[PDB]
Amino acid sequence: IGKTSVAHVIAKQSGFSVSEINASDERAGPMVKEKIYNLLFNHTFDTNPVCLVADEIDGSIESGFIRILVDIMQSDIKATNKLLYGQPSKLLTRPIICICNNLYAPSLEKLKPFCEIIAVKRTTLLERLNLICHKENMNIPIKAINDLIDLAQGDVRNCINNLQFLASN
């Protein structure tokens, strides 16, 4: 339905540099830890602040990735309370977007209280393909794009390749 595409477009539209991590492939939370800490707390060489996008967070069979995010959140809550109430600690200055297929996955139970939950319901692919057609100067009828979406079963990569093949002809 475009969960990943919407996260990327809205983060870029808001002036953030997007860093994507697939949480299912990274079978080393404790190691990844260094990647996430560098991406949240170090200045990137880019002029634009980083937004972390974590895809497939429900696929992490090892709670390492989610434990690291929970530890970062708890550390930032402790650091904020010290700034509010502390008489005379890395604060989270970067947004985190997480994407799942299943909300009630057991691994996410600890993360949910820190999250703003947004449901994406079942058009967005058609709008994207039209924008590609217009930028490549291709006059494609909207009917043929729908027929290509139906052929590709909502695979965005397959849609773009079939469109590229139609353009070369």
């Binding site: 695979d155 990569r157 397959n158 773009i160 390749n161 079939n162 093949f165 070369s168 002809n169």
Partner: protein, 319 residues
């Protein structure tokens, strides 16, 4: 005898995209691509002997000119095409520096892409994605379903179809004119009938008939080549009376040396692909052909089993 001559399939193998009498749409598409350049990743699928390997070879040759030797990487199923090869050699070829015209690209031809392992196919994704501006991939396979969907998503899909009677007839007439062979209309008709949309098989049968008898006549073609095995099986299954089917099975198939396994398996194919009768009767005939099979595979393969299968099929057709 000291040496042989090149066969007509290899000698008259097309070297220009105009000589291909295949699917006109894809042929003109590839011709315009070679004329303009910017060849994208492609996967050509179809059936054996319709001009898939020759098409991509002609495209690569016309697109690369004299740089074909150092700009085209050919890998067939005869060579190792595992994860190690894709990791080392294909990546080294894609990363190789080469000064080409501003409209050409390095081509990696992979014949029989349906035989590559899953690991190699998975590794090829980023290999073709990171070097898509100086290296292009052309796959030639028979079953597009054997190639993973991520690989198909990054390339065009060209599905080649069977060659109609007119195209194969025109190509055979061109070959006869180029070879000065004595022929006749019924002989060419029998050749095309026994070819079944297979241009390579058609040219092979033509050359064999020429070298065996000299005159391309239907009698010679039928005495040297076998009437499409499936057609006699279809005529046997579509028989109305039991005695006619039994006589057909006895004379045409059993008295000519056709093994029972070939008869039953050809029988299954004919039925599955049948369209004259309804679905339920077709399923019942397939069931009978298959229960028998279960006996054919156990070593009980004789003429009595096929006769009983035909009798059961007729009893099913007997309302």
């Amino acid at each position: 005898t000291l040496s042989l001559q090149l066969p007509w399939v290899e000698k008259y193998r097309p070297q220009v995209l105009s000589d291909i009498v295949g699917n006109k749409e894809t042929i003109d598409r590839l011709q315009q691509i070679a004329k303009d350049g910017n060849m994208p990743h492609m996967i050509i699928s179809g059936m054996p002997g319709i001009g898939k390997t020759t098409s991509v070879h002609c495209l690569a040759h016309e697109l690369l000119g004299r740089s074909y030797a150092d700009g085209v990487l050919e890998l067939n199923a005869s060579d190792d095409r595992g994860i190690d090869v894709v990791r080392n050699q294909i990546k080294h070829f894609a990363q190789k520096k080469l000064h080409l015209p501003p409209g050409k690209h390095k081509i990696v031809i992979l014949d029989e892409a349906d035989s590559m392992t899953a690991g190699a196919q998975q590794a090829l994704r980023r290999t073709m994605e990171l070097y898509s501006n100086s290296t292009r991939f052309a796959f030639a396979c028979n079953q597009s379903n054997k190639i993973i969907e991520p690989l198909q998503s990054r390339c065009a899909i060209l599905r080649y179809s069977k060659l109609s009677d007119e195209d194969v007839l025109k190509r055979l007439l061109q070959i006869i004119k180029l070879e000065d062979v004595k022929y006749t209309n019924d002989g060419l008709e029998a050749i095309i009938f026994t070819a079944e949309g297979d241009m390579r098989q058609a040219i092979n049968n033509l050359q064999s008939t020429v070298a065996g008898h000299g005159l391309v006549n239907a009698d010679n073609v039928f005495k040297i080549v076998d009437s499409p095995h499936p057609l006699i099986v279809k005529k046997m299954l579509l028989a109305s009376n039991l005695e006619d089917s039994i006589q057909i099975l006895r004379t045409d198939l059993w008295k000519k040396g056709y093994s029972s396994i070939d008869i039953v398996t050809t029988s299954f194919r004919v039925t599955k692909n049948l369209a004259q009768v309804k679905e339920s009767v077709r399923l019942e005939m397939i069931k009978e052909i298959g229960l028998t099979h279960m006996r054919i595979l156990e070593g009980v393969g004789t003429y009595l089993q096929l006769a009983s299968m035909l009798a059961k099929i007729h009893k099913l057709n007997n309302k």
